[PDB]
Design a protein around this nucleic acid. Structure first.
Lengths: 102, 25, 98, 66
RNA sequence: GGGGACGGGUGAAACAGGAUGAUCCCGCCGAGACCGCCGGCCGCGCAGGCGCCUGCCAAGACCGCCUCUGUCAAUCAAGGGCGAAGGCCGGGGGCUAGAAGGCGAUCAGACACCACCGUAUUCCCGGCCGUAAACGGUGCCGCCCCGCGGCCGGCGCGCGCGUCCCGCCGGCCGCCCAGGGAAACCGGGAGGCUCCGGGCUCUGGGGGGAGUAUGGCCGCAAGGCUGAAACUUGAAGGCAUUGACGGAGGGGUACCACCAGACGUGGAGUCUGCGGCUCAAUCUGACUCAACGCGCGCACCUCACCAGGCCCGGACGCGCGGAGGACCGACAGCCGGGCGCGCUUUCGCGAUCGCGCGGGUGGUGGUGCAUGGCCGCUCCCAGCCCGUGGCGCGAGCCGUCUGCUCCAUUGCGACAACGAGCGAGACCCCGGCCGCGGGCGCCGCGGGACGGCCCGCGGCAGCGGGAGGACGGCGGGGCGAUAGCAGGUCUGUGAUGCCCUCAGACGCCCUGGGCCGCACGCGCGCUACACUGGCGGGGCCAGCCGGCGCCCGCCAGGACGCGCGGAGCCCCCGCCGUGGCCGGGACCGCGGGCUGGAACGCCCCCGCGCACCAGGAAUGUCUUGUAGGCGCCCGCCCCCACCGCG
């Protein structure tokens, strides 16, 4: 979805928050969008957009955090979009740190 | 000390100029 | 900005102070701005004091102390760690610490 | 040696705030049994549950003197 | 006078000094400066300034007062005097430092800093000069203005009474509530001011040009004081706040640091990579950590490079051509390593198409400094944020703390902060131990260990010790924040922008060669230098996880089979006996084999027995099943490990 809106010439931060909101609506604790490439300039900069908490370390990253890289070939060269969604709660395993406490 | 060094440079130009006016009186 | 009210010197009700020289640098420094730490030490090191004290054939003579006022220029003082560059908060402290 | 982390620490107080009589001053197994009562205190992993209990045992020991 | 070899100097030095005896020590002596330590949030002076001892002279502020006068006052162009240092003039003086000068070391060059010698000067008297960051960067006189201090000089009060105490006046000051200010800050003002008016003088009006030009005045001069314009320009500047740096101060921490030890390397031979060298080509990246057994085995392929030689496998689309004939094939001989490649020849062949134009597809081609992706590194670290409040006019800070604890931003404690998050940890993997269920094969799920307990020392987090227990205080790994960086890779890819080479090709194949060439210098290794060892036989033994039989062969291996099996070190006994020796196996002369299409690759066997007798300046890695020692397996592979991963 991000790859389509980027080839549709949408301002990148507008689209990135649109993808973030489509995972924010879905109940993900956070979503991290990284767009890297020659974004309008010869120099390459990576525009990281993030909303809500995401986790990056240990085994719960393999389970709770999903990731997706697409090599969208923009005209100037090739950009790379990486969408990552963090779903804290799934039907099976639960966070090995989160202590509920009654 | 660029201000003190500018004044000295100004002075060594004004003394030269004062000498040149004295040649023609 | 003005770093210190004192201006780095203790001059009060005066326009001129007697010049002194850094013991290390030899820079002329007005008496008010000099670091001025007085030291009273012992003529020989403590490590040699025991052996010298045993050596003396006199009945009760202690190793006689050496008194010198070391006066240092600002640069000589910061390089030789006599005084330290402090934060704007601790710069005000005046009591001798440690 | 082993320094308790904020999860292993805040939860221990929350357990001694809610429960007083159930845990005892030098009773790791009892402190591990109270902290293991399913929904009343839920700590995934015995390693975290054991560590919580040890800090509860230390906190319970502290409160009994004063 | 003494006594004896160097002394100075420095960051290290070097030029000077010293048997003409220096330095050093003492006894003296001359000269000229200088007034130490006491010496200050001391004091005095109009400022500049002021510090030996005595004597003298004139003054000065402060204070006290029921003394005198009676506004005699405040500030001030013009005008007068004073005015650090340096300088100048006419004399004196000449010790010390020391602008200039010269010099030794530097460094590319320093002529500079640093060392040495040194003239003016420094110092005195008589004049000049008239400048200083001449500062509190704050004119002067006057008023009210909030506490808490210190010092200073008078004066008075209390008290038995001491350099006590409380005040008063005057000076020097610190901290500061309001108040102010763009803040810094100031509050004995920079307060009482947009709510703007006590009095007097001075000065400024964006940055430069320029304190220049010119005229004047002044000076012996140097120069002072006064003082433009033409012209140029979008900022210059103030004070704060985040960062980024520092050749700054602290704290902290880590065997990629050290300590205490270990086992090393650097010294030899070789193995492999790197530079250079040499070439037809020696294809290339990578050059501190964070290039260099690195881009997981180069006879061929790989292979990108060289010497040659085929081949369209140029798609689609249009204009023309061609079917009795588009296009390519071919025997034999020549030529050519060889190929119907070409050539002689004369046969085939069947629109899969030719040609012109466009327009492709492919390229281990370039550019990683156009890029995606992925790794390295900072990071074998511990930071990174947010919501609400507090403080700021704000940028913002606080939280996230100069204390303690930790392995850790790991927690405690203090505290305008209070709670959360991410990273840390937890988690995941394997291991030791107990149980359960199963069992072609030990392999599935559950417990267990938590600084729990005990003794100290601690508010504390914890800091040592003691057991009990497979297991003890982060077991041996995976994962890895926020940011990054012109790290590395276009040569891993149907990842890619751009130049796209595009047919006598940089495509794609085949052969031959190189990538392994070697006056040399280096990195990772291996094998050594032996008697804690080599050499013979005798036991025995693993784990990652694991095939063998039989016959022929000294072997290496080969033939023919079947369904299956395992190290060295070490130990035990002989032997050699300090000899470069049976230590060491480098080089080289036969051979016998292997794997392949083909050795140049490897193995084996009989010679041949090099250096090296423990490694210089240096440099590495390491804390218990550890270092080291010893083998084994796999990775890649036709063959082959001195490598890597186990």
């Amino acid at each position: 979805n991000l790859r389509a809106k980027l080839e549709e010439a949408m301002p990148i931060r507008r689209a990135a928050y649109s993808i973030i909101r489509t995972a924010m609506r879905a109940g993900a604790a956070g979503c991290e969008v990284i767009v890297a490439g020659k974004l309008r300039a010869q120099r390459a900069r990576a525009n990281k957009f993030k909303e809500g908490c995401l986790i990056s370390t240990g085994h719960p990253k393999r389970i709770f955090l999903a990731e997706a890289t697409r090599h969208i070939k923009m005209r100037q060269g090739v950009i790379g979009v990486k969408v990552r969604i963090y779903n804290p709660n799934i039907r099976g395993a639960v966070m090995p740190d989160k202590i509920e406490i009654g | 000390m660029r201000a003190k060094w500018a004044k000295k440079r100004m002075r060594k130009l004004k003394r030269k100029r004062r000498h040149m006016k004295a040649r023609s009186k | 900005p003005v770093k210190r009210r004192n201006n780095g010197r203790s001059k009060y009700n005066c326009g001129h102070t007697n010049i002194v020289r850094c013991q290390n640098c030899h820079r002329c420094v007005p008496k008010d701005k000099v670091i001025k730490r007085f030291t009273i030490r012992n003529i020989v090191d403590n490590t040699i004091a025991d052996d010298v004290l045993n050596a003396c054939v006199i009945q009760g003579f202690a190793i006689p102390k050496l008194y010198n006022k070391v006066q240092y220029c600002v640069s000589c003082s910061i390089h030789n760690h006599i005084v330290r560059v402090r934060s704007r908060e601790d710069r005000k402290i005046r009591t001798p610490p440690k | 040696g082993k320094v308790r982390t904020k999860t292993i620490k805040r939860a221990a107080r929350k357990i001694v705030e809610n429960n007083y009589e159930s845990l005892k001053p030098k009773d790791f197994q009892n402190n591990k049994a109270i902290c293991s009562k399913r929904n009343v205190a839920i700590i995934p992993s015995k390693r975290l549950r054991n560590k919580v209990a040890g800090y509860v045992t230390t906190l319970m020991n502290r409160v009994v003197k004063g």
